[PDB]
Design a protein around this ligand. Structure first.
Ligand SMILES: C/C=C(/C)C(=O)O[C@@H]1C[C@H]2C(=C1C)[C@@H]1OC(=O)[C@@](C)(O)[C@@]1(O)[C@@H](OC(=O)CCCCCCCCCCC)C[C@]2(C)OC(C)=O
Ligand SMILES: [K+]
Ligand SMILES: [Mg+2]
Length: 994
């Protein structure tokens, strides 16, 4: 039963048909349980090693390798008895690759954490009900509570379900709904129904939300909803229904796999055609078994050559580094793949209070009425100093200090500020600072009181531990606070019924002290206190009052104002029902205005600039605040969301206005809006959807469990470090200092990261392109494998990885934050850059094949078969008399392979230098720009020699050191690459719209 809040205590007992005195019966219990199910959120997502591990082998690339590893394994164990036992080091390495990346995927995910799982931390294990099967209370398991049965809760207890309160046993019930609603201060509950059927949780004063805590009291109530139908359950459902897309890069990876898959097979078709003559050859002899082995060994090589096996390692090590780098700047990024999406954010929705402002209130101006006479009128504005809650400052009229006592209007303004106030101050030795006790806007008022001690009471003769609440406790012993009418958004105010202490003063006694939003409070005033006297509130004086409030809340001050009043002759105590906030506005009427106080929540230093950066970066910044409209705008101008004189009519909306619109304009408002005031949880999710309907990468801030649905729906959920853990676990990033600027600093790094990341990716991908061209030639000619999978792997993993990771530390462009947000759909390689790698690839594929074919033909160390189709090498033993008057093992020589392998290795180091910049020539951007790059190249080259000399290595890599004259052959073949590209870059920079 929803809406329980708008129903009466009786109607709820009626609906379920249960007795507040007996509690459901067992027949009612088991029946309700088969209709409402158990009181608990659904289980977890069932994924097992079998299932988990599978995916790790779902990726097309991985699939392709797994296959190749097999063909390899088969051949590897299907040749000579011991011609080279190392026949197995090929399939084994591939497997280790796949195996290792899987062990990564698994360990990776296992250390993840579900935001929905985090919700269960708010489910109590036990609960307390009164059922017919016993007169005394039973402490059962929460999971077994049902809609309708009578529940009992008290201090310390965590609410087990959404409960409609029946009767409060204590004198007051206080609940900590921080997580849901938000208000961190314990809020007061009642029993009377809330009219509005569509009331927001914050106003369901007669409800207990499952998951919240009883800060103070004991109550009895009936369970309205259970499990998934509770406020928090409704939230779990939204998060479960949320589906996150794949990072643009992750999409590009799948798309790239789908292609690489096609090209490969197309090459096979082509290759098969190139050697179609085999179908016009002898009907006997040859070797269908040897030619086959050949085409299969080409398959496996082709595959190893087409996939960037070192990329996974390079990409993660790059992100891991950035991550740590951002943490140093207070941006904790959980989910490495997010660093990217982060960088492309186009819109940022930020909560104001804790992140755009400091949330450290302080009163700057006061004002009481000085004189009313006819239509003449004169106020007594003031100004106050001190931005800290610290009791140190001065009050001033026209910048000139003053002793507040000389004014009676201030004597009262202060008393009201000290009595109608649930908060306070406290000094600590730990940090020697004065800390806010209750709430921020109230803890500021107690502070104001100290700074204007109306009575001049001595205090410099007091420490700081007592200086805290000194001038306040005086006013506290001057009146006796009978009771307080707590704040409610309907009347936008709160009051307190005090009664004079002793007879010493006993001045008319029983006074009512109210403080609230001006509009409301001033309307309920029929009088105005001028110092010590009273006069009837009149139109003139009213205008003069509202005006100053508008200038303080709209003007460049952007101050939040609080009207302060007193009800001189309040109703008789007996005639008041202190337990139905519905009658409180009635009690707070026929008031006399005593003064207003305007306080300020200061923007943070770094925020002003940060807002500017977003402008230059093409990132839209949307403020989400509580402050009423008009004032919200003021705040936006003050921080730069709006220009002091910039129009804002259509760029600012209130939760109401927005709801009042049709899906049509609701969506339109979102593309141009920049300020949302008096919002609501429902809105944050709606606002994201719209922003998304414009393919905008939006980041959203939040911190309570009520923000999690939206935090998880945005492209980047940003949680506050001081926020709940649920908020955190549902966001991709956490602000250690809750500072907005931290966000911008993070988006920047993101853009940086992607830029280098984008280079080394192009680099590795390009090398694969060439490696493949090589393999395509070696086989389209019918010549000996110039390159082996084992070597290719070593290169794609080790020799090329080092330079690739180095490219991760490439200097960041200085204009990063001056260009708009990168389009997610922008391809890593297309247009001219494509053609370049197309060509470069074509080059290394030739250099490598030719390099090895050179040591065969034109070599001084090996028998050069000159220009005689050395390809038919397949037929030597059988035809040792037709063009073969020499050995036949020369075709499996190590020299020709180390020849082609070394041209690759060096062409790669050259390419790793052509990758320091997409278009800038090496003369303009020299290799030394990135020390790491050069240094890594030495480790690569030497590591190359490591496998040419050290025993095990060469033997198993099919490599044998080459002399100082062959090496020069390498340099002559490879080095030119730097030139080929320099030319292509020149074409891009000059003869090309770039
Ligand atoms: C690979 C070997 C051979 C023999 C081959 O044939 O590669 C072809 C050629 C083509 C592509 C292939 C499939 C790609 O297919 C695509 O769909 C595109 C449009 O990606 C693609 O066209 C380009 O690659 C790219 O843009 C960058 C793709 C980057 C993919 C990985 C992104 C990062 C993944 C991160 C995961 C966390 C250009 C590319 C290669 O040609 C040239 C000259 O670069
Ligand atoms: K998200
Ligand atoms: Mg919140």
């Amino acid at each position: 039963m929803e809406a329980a809040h708008s129903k009466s205590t009786e109607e709820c007992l009626a609906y379920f048909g249960v007795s507040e005195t007996t509690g459901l019966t067992p027949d009612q219990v088991k029946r309700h349980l088969e209709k409402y199910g158990h009181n608990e959120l659904p289980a977890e997502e069932g994924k097992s090693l079998w299932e988990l591990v599978i995916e790790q082998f779902e990726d097309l690339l991985v699939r392709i390798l797994l296959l190749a590893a097999c063909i390899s394994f088969v051949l590897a164990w299907f040749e000579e008895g011991e011609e080279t036992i190392t026949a197995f080091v090929e399939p084994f390495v591939i497997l280790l690759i796949l195996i290792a990346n899987a062990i990564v995927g698994v360990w990776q995910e296992r250390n993840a954490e579900n935001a929905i799982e985090a919700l269960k931390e708010y489910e109590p294990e036990m609960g307390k009900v009164y059922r017919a099967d016993r007169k005394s209370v039973q402490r059962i398991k929460a999971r077994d509570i049902v809609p309708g049965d009578i529940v009992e809760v008290a201090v310390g207890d965590k609410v087990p379900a959404d409960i409609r309160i029946l009767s409060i046993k204590s004198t007051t019930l206080r609940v900590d709904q921080s997580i849901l609603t938000g208000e961190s201060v314990s809020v007061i509950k009642h029993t009377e129904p809330v009219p509005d059927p569509r009331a927001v949780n914050q106003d369901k004063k007669n409800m207990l939300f499952s998951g919240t805590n009883i800060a103070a009291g004991k109550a009895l109530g009936i369970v309205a909803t259970t499990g998934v139908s509770t406020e928090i359950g409704k939230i779990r459902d939204q998060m479960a229904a949320t589906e996150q897309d794949k990072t643009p890069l992750q999409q590009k990876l799948d798309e790239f796999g789908e292609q690489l898959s096609k090209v490969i097979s197309l090459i096979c078709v082509a290759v098969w055609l190139i050697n179609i003559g085999h179908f016009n050859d002898p009907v006997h002899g040859g070797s269908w078994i040897r030619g086959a082995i050949y085409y299969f060994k080409i398959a496996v090589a082709l595959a190893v050559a087409a996939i960037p096996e070192g990329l996974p390692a390079v990409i993660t090590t790059c992100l891991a580094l950035g991550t740590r780098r951002m943490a140093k700047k207070n941006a904790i990024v959980r989910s490495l793949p997010s660093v990217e999406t982060l960088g492309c954010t186009s819109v940022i929705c930020s909560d104001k209070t804790g992140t755009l402002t400091t949330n450290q209130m302080s009163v700057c101006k006061m004002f009481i009425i000085d004189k009313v006479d006819g239509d003449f009128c004169s106020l007594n504005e003031f100004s106050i100093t001190g931005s800290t809650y610290a009791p140190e400052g001065e009050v001033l009229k026209n910048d000139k200090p003053i002793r507040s006592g000389q004014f009676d209007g201030l004597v009262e303004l202060a008393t009201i500020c000290a009595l109608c106030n649930d908060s306070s101050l406290d000094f600590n030795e730990t940090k020697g600072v004065y800390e806010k006790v209750g709430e921020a806007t109230e803890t500021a008022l107690t502070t104001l009181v100290e700074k204007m001690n109306v009575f001049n009471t001595e205090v410099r003769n007091l420490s700081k531990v007592e200086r805290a609440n000194a001038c306040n406790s005086v006013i506290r012993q001057l009146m006796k606070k009978e009771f307080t009418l707590e704040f409610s958004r309907d009347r936008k105010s709160m009051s307190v019924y005090c009664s004079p202490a002793k007879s010493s003063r006993a001045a008319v006694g029983n006074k009512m002290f109210v403080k609230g939003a001006p509009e409301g409070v001033i309307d309920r005033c029929n009088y105005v206190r001028v110092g010590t006297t009273r006069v009837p509130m009149t139109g003139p004086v009213k205008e003069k009052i509202l005006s100053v409030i508008k200038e303080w809340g709209t003007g460049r001050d952007t101050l939040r104002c609080l009207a302060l009043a007193t009800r001189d002759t309040p109703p008789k105590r007996e005639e008041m029902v202190l337990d139905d906030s519905s009658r409180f506005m009635e009690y707070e009427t026929d008031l006399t205005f005593v003064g207003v106080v305007g306080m300020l929540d200061p923007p943070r230093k770094e925020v002003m600039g940060s807002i500017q950066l977003c402008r230059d970066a093409g990132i839209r910044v949307i403020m989400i605040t509580g402050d009423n409209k008009g004032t919200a705008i003021a705040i936006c101008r003050r921080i730069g969301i709006f220009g002091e004189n910039e129009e804002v009519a259509d760029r600012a909306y209130t939760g109401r206005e927005f709801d009042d619109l049709p899906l049509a304009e609701q969506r339109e408002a979102c593309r141009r809006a920049c300020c949302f005031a008096r919002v609501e949880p429902s809105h944050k999710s709606k606002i994201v959807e719209y922003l998304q309907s414009y393919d905008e990468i939006t980041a959203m801030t939040g911190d309570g469990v009520n923000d999690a649905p939206a935090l998880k729906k945005a492209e980047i959920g940003i949680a506050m470090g001081s926020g709940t853990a649920v908020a955190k676990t549902a966001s991709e990033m956490v602000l250690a200092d809750d500072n907005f600027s931290t966000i911008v600093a993070a988006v920047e790094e993101g853009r940086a990261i992607y830029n280098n990341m984008k280079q080394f990716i192009r680099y590795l991908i390009s090398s694969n392109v060439g490696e493949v061209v090589c393999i395509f030639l070696t086989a389209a000619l019918g010549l000996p494998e110039a390159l082996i999978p084992v070597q290719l792997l070593w290169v794609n993993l080790v020799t090329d990885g080092l330079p690739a990771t180095a490219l991760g530390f490439n200097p960041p462009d200085l204009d990063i934050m001056d260009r708009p947000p990168r389009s997610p759909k922008e391809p890593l390689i297309s247009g001219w850059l494509f053609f370049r790698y197309m060509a470069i690839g074509g080059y290394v594929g030739a250099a490598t094949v030719g390099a090895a074919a050179w040591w065969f033909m034109y070599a001084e160390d090996g028998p050069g078969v000159t220009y005689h189709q050395l390809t038919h090498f397949m037929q030597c033993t059988e035809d040792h008399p037709h063009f073969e008057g020499l050995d036949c093992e020369i075709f499996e020589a190590p020299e020709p392979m180390t020849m082609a392998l070394s041209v690759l290795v060096t062409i790669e180091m050259c390419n790793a230098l052509n990758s320091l910049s997409e278009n800038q020539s090496l003369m303009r951007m020299p290799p030394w720009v990135n020390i790491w790059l050069l240094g890594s190249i030495c480790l690569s080259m030497s590591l190359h020699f490591l496998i040419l000399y050290v025993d095990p290595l060469p033997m198993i890599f099919k490599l044998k050191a080459l002399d100082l004259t062959q090496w020069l052959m390498v340099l002559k073949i490879s080095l030119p690459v730097i030139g080929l590209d320099e030319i292509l870059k020149f074409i891009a920079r000059n003869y090309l719209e770039g």
